[PDB]
């Protein structure tokens, strides 16, 4: 397995295009009918930063949970004692550029549990192999992953 390079995205097209994660349909807020489509991921082998102390980062689409859960396994296999960590997931409060897939519960920013930045290129490759529809080595501090809508 080859790490992603800095600022590399896979597939090599923009996130919201048909070959990647596809179109932004619209913001999901806590009242939405579409809010019911989000369910929480309480996998004990995934660390959630929970920046806002709401548990919001755990709420995500079905596809997102599936890929995230696959990645959790491969991370632990790659580096014994290390776990997948999510820094940001569903955003209810506009902490992104508009039309962010975080507003739809279809995108996570991730690290390893140990915050070892040298692992993140490999973590990105693991995310691709776990079946995330778009993976972007967005910064030294995290990888951005998203999935197609249900």
């Amino acid at each position: 397995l080859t790490p992603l390079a800095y600022k590399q995205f896979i597939p090599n097209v923009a996130e919201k295009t048909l070959g990647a994660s596809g179109r932004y349909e619209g913001k999901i807020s806590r009242n939405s009918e579409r809010f019911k489509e989000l369910t929480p991921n309480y996998n004990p082998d995934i660390i959630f930063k929970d920046e806002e102390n709401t548990g919001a980062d755990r709420l995500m689409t079905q596809r997102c949970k599936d890929k995230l859960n696959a990645l959790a396994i491969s991370v632990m296999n790659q580096w014994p004692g290390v776990k997948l960590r999510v820094t940001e997931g569903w955003d209810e409060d506009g902490h992104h550029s508009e039309e962010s897939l975080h507003y739809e519960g279809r995108a996570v920013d991730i690290t390893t549990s140990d915050r070892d930045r040298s692992k993140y290129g490999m973590l990105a490759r693991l995310a691709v192999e776990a079946g995330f529809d778009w993976v972007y080595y967005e910064s030294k501090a995290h990888i951005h992953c998203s999935v197609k809508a249900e």
Partner: antibody
Framework: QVQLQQSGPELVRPGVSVKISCKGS????????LHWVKQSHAESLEWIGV????????NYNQKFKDKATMTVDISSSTAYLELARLTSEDSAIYYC????????????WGQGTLVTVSS | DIVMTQTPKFLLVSAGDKVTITCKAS??????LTWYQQKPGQSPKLLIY???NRYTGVPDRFTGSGYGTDFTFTISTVQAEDLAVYFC?????????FGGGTKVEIKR
């Protein structure tokens, strides 16, 4: 509400050290990197270094390697910057500032501590 | 260490007019370019990161562009409250380094 509260302005003699403080509230202190930045006439803004409370890792700008020491007290949610062997070139405002793990840039800043080196 | 050259040093502009500030890095820094605003007496406030992404709550009139060495910060329709020094910062290289700033003054 995230807040970084720094210690007050300091008059300090040349050759002496000064220790300044930055207390974080309104978020989980240990979770985020804390950076220190110097603002002077001479050089506008300069990054001094970063401390990662969760690991105790420190990274210094080589230019401040022999000048600056960064520590933290988790129990009081306070980061400290010690500047040793002060000369007039150390007179400046010193800020602490946090990142939010999007990259090494800073949403929340302290109010700044003015350090005047003088006899 | 990467050097950030910011121009112009000073701008005079009427409320409603456009502001264009440039920062050039001494080597390519990807899109790892942050723009801050420092009003008088105050600490810097982050407006744009990754060259073009607005921070939470930052008004639409602020934009940024560029990838590599050459970056552009724009205030589309400058408001009275926008008087400040603006600074860029790169964090592609270590250490992070900042530009020397652009002071934006209002004509009335």
């Amino acid at each position: 509400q995230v807040q970084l509260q720094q210690s007050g302005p300091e008059l300090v003699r040349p050759g002496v050290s000064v220790k300044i403080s930055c207390k974080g509230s309104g978020y989980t202190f240990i979770d985020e990197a804390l950076h220190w930045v110097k603002q002077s006439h001479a050089e506008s803004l300069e990054w001094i270094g970063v401390i990662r409370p969760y690991s105790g890792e420190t990274n210094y700008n080589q230019k401040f390697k022999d000048k600056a020491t960064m520590t933290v007290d988790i129990s009081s949610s306070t980061a400290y910057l010690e500047l040793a062997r002060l000369t007039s070139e150390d007179s400046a405002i010193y800020y602490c500032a946090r990142d939010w793990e999007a990259g090494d840039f800073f949403d929340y800043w302290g109010q700044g501590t003015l350090v005047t080196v003088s006899s | 260490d990467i050097v950030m050259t910011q121009t112009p040093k000073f701008l005079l502009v009427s409320a409603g007019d456009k502001v264009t500030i440039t920062c050039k890095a001494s080597q390519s820094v990807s899109n790892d370019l942050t723009w801050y605003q420092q009003k008088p007496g105050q600490s810097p406030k982050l407006l744009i990161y990754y060259a073009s992404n607005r921070y939470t709550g930052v008004p639409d009139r602020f934009t940024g562009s560029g990838y590599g060495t050459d970056f552009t910060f724009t205030i589309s329709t400058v408001q009275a409250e926008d008087l400040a020094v603006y600074f860029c910062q790169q964090d592609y290289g270590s250490p992070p380094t900042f530009g020397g700033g652009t002071k934006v003054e209002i004509k009335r």
